[PDB]
Ligand binder design. Structure first.
Ligand SMILES: COC(=O)[C@H](Cc1ccccc1)NC(=O)CCc1nc2ccccc2c(=O)[nH]1
Length: 352
């Protein structure tokens, strides 16, 4: 079986190496305090996660009797999903906060498993006498087009400022590479929202073990997903807010982190200053709910872009106080869309 040469550039070789690394997914599992010696990457199945979520479904009903205890039902979740706690008694899930924390850990594992199932060798690849370079195979597996952009691009100095001015003042993410993303299948669903305006290019931060799943499926509204403002996709106009979720992985003296830039079609937006986890969609006549923050990049330093004949607002300015929302329960803005079709990824960033 002849191994074909790598057609990808060094930057795209790194990206694919990182996001598809077994060590990276195993390390992401170690950080989520999961026992990788009792739950290996290859043993990780859609049945085990279903069971895990089923065990959290039973716990959720106990907080909201006569049945089993909170210590008895927690014990089963730990028997299903094994954690490394130094061989000591596990703690019971006794709050909505811990419930969603243990729900958000299974939402990462689902993408860790997805990427694994994605890398399965088809019988078409078996009846074929030649194989592509492993990196080129993984790149083909995403069914996504990543275009590495240089300094001499209309959108390079646009995104550079965006990252600088809205990124944390002292802990500034050092930009390395920008890939223009084009997901095949995500084009038409967003094209339907042509009637819906108020287009804004907004950040989205994730840990390295879900990057590939987003490069294959796009950004989703998963069953058992949620947070401070409900079952929608979370976007920040400030880079600092998104970068909190990006766990930096060590690589010599440097740290690796990958960040997304989605195109959010908001339309008639409904603002808020209080947390509402119970949300599943916006109020009628509205298409997006935005949790307004204490600070915001001054909408006077804003720029625009023409992505597929549409005008996308790009915030370029530094955060500024917002007296209309001076008493908001959110320090920084959070943008929520309640239908996947209203997003389309536009850029993948490499930050150090
Ligand atoms: C591994 O990916 C993550 O870090 C997790 C949970 C999650 C989400 C999707 C798939 C898997 C896991 N969270 C996100 O992708 C969203 C994180 C995020 N939350 C925000 C909340 C408010 C405002 C902005 C953000 C944001 O930019 N990213």
């Amino acid at each position: 079986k002849r191994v074909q040469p790598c057609s990808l550039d060094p930057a795209t070789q790194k990206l694919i190496t990182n996001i598809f690394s077994k060590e990276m997914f195993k390390n992401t599992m170690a950080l989520m305090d999961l026992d990788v010696k009792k739950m290996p990457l290859g043993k990780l199945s859609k049945q085990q996660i279903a069971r895990g979520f089923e065990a959290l479904e039973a716990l959720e009903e106990a907080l909201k009797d006569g049945g089993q205890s909170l210590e008895e039902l927690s014990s089963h979740f730990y028997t299903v999903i094994p954690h490394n706690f130094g061989h000591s008694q596990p703690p019971p899930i006794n709050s909505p906060e811990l419930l969603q924390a243990k729900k958000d850990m299974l939402l990462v594992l689902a993408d860790i498993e997805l990427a694994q199932a994605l890398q399965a060798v088809s019988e078409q690849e078996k009846t074929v006498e030649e194989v592509p370079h492993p990196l080129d195979r993984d790149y083909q597996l995403l069914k996504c087009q990543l275009q590495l952009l240089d300094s001499g691009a209309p959108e390079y100095k646009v995104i550079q400022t965006y990252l600088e001015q809205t990124g944390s003042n002292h802990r500034c993410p050092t930009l390395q590479h920008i890939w223009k993303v084009n997901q095949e299948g995500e084009e038409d669903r967003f094209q339907a929202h042509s009637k819906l305006g108020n287009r804004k290019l907004l950040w989205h931060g994730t840990n390295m073990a879900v990057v590939a799943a987003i490069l294959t499926s796009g950004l989703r509204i998963m069953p058992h997903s949620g947070g401070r403002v409900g079952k929608g996709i979370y976007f920040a106009s400030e880079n600092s807010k998104s970068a909190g979720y990006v766990i930096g992985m060590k690589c010599g003296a440097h740290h690796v982190g990958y960040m997304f830039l989605g195109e959010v079609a908001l339309g008639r937006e409904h603002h808020i200053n209080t947390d509402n986890p119970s949300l599943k969609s916006p109020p009628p006549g509205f298409d997006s709910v935005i949790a307004r923050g204490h600070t915001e990049p001054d909408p006077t330093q804003d720029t625009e872009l023409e992505l597929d004949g549409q005008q996308v607002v790009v915030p370029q300015g530094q955060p500024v106080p917002c007296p209309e929302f001076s008493s908001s329960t959110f320090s920084q803005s959070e943008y929520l869309i309640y239908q996947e079709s209203q997003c389309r990824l536009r850029y993948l960033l490499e930050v150090h």
